[PDB]
Design a protein around this nucleic acid. Structure first.
Ligand SMILES: [Mg+2]
Ligand SMILES: [Mg+2]
Ligand SMILES: [Mg+2]
Ligand SMILES: [Mg+2]
Ligand SMILES: [Mg+2]
Ligand SMILES: [Mg+2]
Ligand SMILES: [Mg+2]
Ligand SMILES: [Mg+2]
Ligand SMILES: [Mg+2]
Ligand SMILES: [Mg+2]
Lengths: 58, 134, 205, 113, 108
RNA sequence: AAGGAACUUUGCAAUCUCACCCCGUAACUUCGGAAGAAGGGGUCCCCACGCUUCGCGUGGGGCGCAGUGAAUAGGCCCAG
RNA sequence: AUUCCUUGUCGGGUAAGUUCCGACCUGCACGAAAGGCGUAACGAUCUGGGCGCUGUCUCAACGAGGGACUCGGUGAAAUU
RNA sequence: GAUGUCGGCUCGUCGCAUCCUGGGGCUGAAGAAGGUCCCAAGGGUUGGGCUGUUCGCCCAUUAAAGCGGCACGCGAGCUGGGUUCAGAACGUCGUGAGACAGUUCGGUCUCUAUCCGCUACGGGCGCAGGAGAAUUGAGGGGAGUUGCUCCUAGUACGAGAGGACCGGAGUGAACGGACCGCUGGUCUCCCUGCUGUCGUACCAACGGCACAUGCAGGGUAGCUAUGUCCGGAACGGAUAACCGCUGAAAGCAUCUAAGCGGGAAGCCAGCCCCAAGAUGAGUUCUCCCACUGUUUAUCAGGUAAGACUCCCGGAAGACCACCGGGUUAAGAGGCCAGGCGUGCACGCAUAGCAAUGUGUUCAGCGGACUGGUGCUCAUCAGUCGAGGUCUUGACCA
């Protein structure tokens, strides 16, 4: 049938013992020099569409 | 390289046209006759190595015959021998020379060039019937 | 004892008399002496030597200082050698000498995660007369209820390579001082451009 | 190891189809948006292509005809865009990354002439 | 690993031209390598393999050439290091007309 | 690469053969067959010449490692 | 394919054969329509052998694609 | 309410009542070759033919070609030949349905590892300031095989035939590590050649599809073996068997009770590798420094030295990690030069009825290789990160 299978239910604790590594790091947002919303380092500022000049369209 | 089940051509009028390998001895020509094995393994016969063999084809009329079990010395491997200058040799087919417990060609002469390797191997007489020693 | 640092540059052909010879070209670049250690200072006897040069605009304020304590010039690579000495700096000139046997050590090329056929040789199996274990896969890990577990060390797939390797008694063919170049017979481990440490033979006949 | 030097995700005939395909777009629109990576793979291929176009003679043209199956496009690269890059050491095409995407969460990008 | 500034490329040349030799041109078509077989006892022989070149693999110290031939009934291929000290001198014998750097097909 | 059934319960599996012309083809047989037995050759292009035309034959020329030039596409035999 | 003692004995073939072929016969417990013995041709039939080729093997190796890995979307199971 | 069975394949590891190597006593041990008993498990212990075999017989070798154990080691590892399903057959037993000491051909062996165990790789915290880098080695692993030939020496020995110890030299086998210069293998679009078809109007030139490279030929880097290079050691310490000096108890004899020495492939050390989570958390060199916050926000908050984040990459890699660069820039790409591979391009010209040949052309094309070069992008900028307990003692003016 299902050859391997687990021998006992896992501790609500043990469950967690592992999950001690699923915490998302959050973006390191930076502030634009030009529209000042927060941009994502090394990409075009979503809001004003800049990267020294205006690349993407507004 | 040569190994058991590996049919060679006979480069001598020994009478045996084609021989299948049976075992790769660790070619012992030296001292009195042929010295004895240098290990019970060694898997490949290289020009100048001695093998044991079972004659699978002899011509009608000749010392050696079909089904005979003989000793031969590998003179032409289609593998590649590599000399100290750094050159390389390789013949279209593998051929040996049926011989005796003194390492002397059972035949009255060799056929086809033979590995100069046989010379350092001290297999002098063989060399001596060799039409060439590339 | 005696020893030096260098970079593996490549292999090539060279004849000596009439014997073609594969050689590996090491650049035992010159080596600064940045720190002497005595049992009376560091518990033991050794020497700190250096190697690839490094731009000062890339040197930690701390490292700078260490390096200053012996006006040398940020190297980027340091390594100690035991029972060694000399004054000034370490160069192969008068160190190694054509003929000597040496132990070029370096870091093996890195083969990532490798199965057992390729890392311990194993043999896997049948590739035709029935399977799912075709070629690689180790067979059985052990035995039964007894030693109901596997042994501390059974050979299995791991990260192969990326190791420290030493190779012994390699002939020092040609030495071209003042190019801190040195051809060594045979091959040394580690990819071209890697660090390599040539030393007197650790154990020579 | 795997110490080679290229990129796929599809087969042999495909990576080709792509490069050529995007190659065309970019050359036809001076800037297309695509997956960050699909860009990077494209960058050089299109650049090499321009350096070919950058020779004028029928030859250099017909070489380009092998990666541009759209006459109009080829003519552009050949007589309009190649001639212009005349004075620069080849090396023009920049990538600009944008936001991450919703559908797949894949970070999209800009590749412009 | 050690990131010294260096042209690994040349360091090698400089330790390779001291072991590199030029020879006649040839490309295929017959050749005759008159090489010395110094290995018989102390006596220094002199052999002359000759015939169809079938490949010019490599460069520098490593450059070499392969020549096929049929000696006394059985085909033979020799391989020579342009700087193999075992070679006195090579010579064209008669330029051939083929159309591909190899010839392997000639083994038949 | 070299070797070539050494695998192994067993050449299982996977190669090889693989179309169409032509030459050729055994024991044994209820004469039908065994037979596509086995084996060997050919096979593209151009030109001239004749043929029953699609096509084909003869001769000469040509190109490549190779011409059912890529897909479809028998491995054969001995004995029980 | 009916043999136990049994790999019977001799011969064949193989370098070497508990199998296969042929004889012998001492048929544990063959035998004439529960058919006897033989037989060309037929067999995805079962057995032994040979030629050919081969990654079956000596030994593996490189390459490819699909998974396996990683991020975003959805998100089971047997077991306990 | 299930501990899967014979054999094999794979992977091992252990005992010794040791098969071979190593040390020895005795020999009916001349030498050479043996027998035998004791010490000794470091390492090693071939490939085939027949059989489902284990066994065993045989071919050909070998230093040897050991015996057992581990659920007759190992099927959540594979096979599935053997045997304890259903089909069929023969012999035999049964009047039968059926049966068997038997023999014969056939016959589905279940993707998804929780826990322990194992191999690899990270995260956290700790190691009493915060950091950069260099180490000691507590301890632990790997390795630990052997032939043949030469010299000594044709000596010792032996009537002779034959023919050494010891010591010293070479050179193989198998095994393992590293490596890619070589010889080769691959190189899935680097170059070329070829067919059919569809397309780019047509001709000419090209593209697609004929695998998931249409096929063929070749092939850099890389990776790789049947290719290279190196290794198993020396010396040493303590020992086994064994052998000995001095030597009483037995005014003698005695390797022994005092004492002492020699002595094995084995033990420990030495060789290569790991190693301070050796929480008993070690050592060294260098750097940053002692800030701020009213018994209302009691501690965190700026920050230093330093590092991360991110981007561009890598001979590093599943992920992480590790290394390099990130404009004070040569990091990667491109671009230029060169290298190497393919093997002569498109076009035009000329020759030919044509097919094609020849010339311009050692052309043309161009992954991964060597350098160069500021053309592209490594913008901007955010986050984190010390002010160092106490006790005794020693030193300072
Ligand atoms: Mg295998
Ligand atoms: Mg080659
Ligand atoms: Mg019969
Ligand atoms: Mg003894
Ligand atoms: Mg089990
Ligand atoms: Mg190569
Ligand atoms: Mg190909
Ligand atoms: Mg002692
Ligand atoms: Mg990555
Ligand atoms: Mg950095």
């Amino acid at each position: 049938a299902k050859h391997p299978v687990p021998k006992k239910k896992t501790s609500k604790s043990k469950r967690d013992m592992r999950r001690s590594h699923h915490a998302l790091t959050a973006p390191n947002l930076t502030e634009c020099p030009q529209c000042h919303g927060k941009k994502l380092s090394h990409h075009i500022c979503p809001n004003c569409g800049y990267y020294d000049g205006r690349q993407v369209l507004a | 390289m040569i190994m058991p089940q590996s049919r060679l051509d006979v480069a001598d009028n020994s009478g045996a046209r084609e021989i299948m390998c049976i075992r790769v001895l660790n070619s012992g020509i030296g001292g009195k006759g042929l010295t004895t094995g240098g290990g019970g393994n060694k898997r490949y016969a290289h020009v100048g190595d001695i093998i044991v063999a079972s004659v699978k084809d002899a011509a009608p009329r000749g010392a050696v015959k079909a089904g005979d079990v003989v000793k031969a010395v590998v003179v032409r491997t289609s593998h590649a021998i590599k000399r100290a200058d750094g050159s390389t040799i390789r013949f279209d087919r593998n051929a040996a020379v049926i011989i005796n417990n003194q390492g002397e060609p059972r035949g009255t002469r060799v056929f086809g060039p033979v590995a100069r390797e046989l010379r350092d191997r001290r297999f002098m007489k063989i060399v001596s019937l060799a039409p060439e020693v590339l | 004892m005696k020893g030096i640092l260098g970079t593996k540059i490549g292999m090539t052909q060279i004849w000596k008399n009439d014997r073609a010879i594969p050689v590996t070209v090491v650049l035992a670049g010159p080596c600064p002496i940045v720190q002497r250690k005595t049992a009376q200072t560091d518990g033991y006897e050794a020497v700190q030597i250096g190697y690839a040069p490094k731009a000062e605009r890339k040197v930690n304020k701390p490292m700078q200082g260490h390096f200053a304590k012996a006006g040398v010039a940020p190297t980027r690579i340091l390594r100690e050698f035991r029972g060694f000495a000399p004054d000034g700096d370490s160069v192969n000139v008068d160190i190694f000498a054509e003929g000597e046997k040496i132990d070029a050590t370096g870091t093996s090329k890195g083969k990532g995660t490798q199965g057992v056929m390729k890392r311990w040789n194993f043999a896997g199996g049948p590739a035709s007369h029935g399977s799912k274990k075709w070629h690689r896969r180790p067979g059985s890990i052990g035995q039964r209820k007894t030693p109901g577990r596997v042994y501390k060390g059974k050979r299995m797939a791991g990260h192969m390579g990326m190791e420290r390797v030493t190779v012994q008694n390699l002939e020092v063919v040609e030495i071209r001082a003042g190019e801190n170049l040195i051809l060594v017979k045979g091959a040394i481990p580690g990819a071209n451009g890697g660090l390599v440490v040539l030393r007197s033979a650790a154990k020579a006949s | 190891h795997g110490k080679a030097g290229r990129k796929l995700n599809r087969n042999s005939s495909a990576r080709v189809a792509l490069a050529r395909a995007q190659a065309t777009a970019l050359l036809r629109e001076g800037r297309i948006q695509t997956t960050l990576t699909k860009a990077k793979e494209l960058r050089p291929f299109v650049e090499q292509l321009i350096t070919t176009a950058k020779g004028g003679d029928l030859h250099s043209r017909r070489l380009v005809a092998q990666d541009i199956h759209d006459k109009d496009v080829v003519r552009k690269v050949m007589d309009e865009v190649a001639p212009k890059y005349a004075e620069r050491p080849g090396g023009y095409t920049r990538i600009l990354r944008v936001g991450t995407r919703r559908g797949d969460g894949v970070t999209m990008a800009l590749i412009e002439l | 690993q050690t990131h010294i500034k260096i042209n690994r490329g040349e360091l090698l040349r400089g330790i390779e031209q001291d072991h590199t030799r030029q020879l006649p041109d040839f490309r295929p078509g017959d050749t005759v390598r008159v090489d010395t077989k110094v290995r018989e006892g102390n006596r220094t022989r002199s052999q002359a393999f000759e015939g169809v070149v079938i490949a010019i693999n490599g460069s520098g110290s490593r450059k070499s050439f392969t020549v096929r031939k049929i000696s006394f009934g059985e085909g033979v291929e020799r391989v020579f290091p342009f700087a193999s000290p075992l070679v006195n001198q090579v010579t064209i014998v008669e330029r051939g007309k083929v159309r591909r750097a190899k010839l392997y097909y000639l083994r038949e």
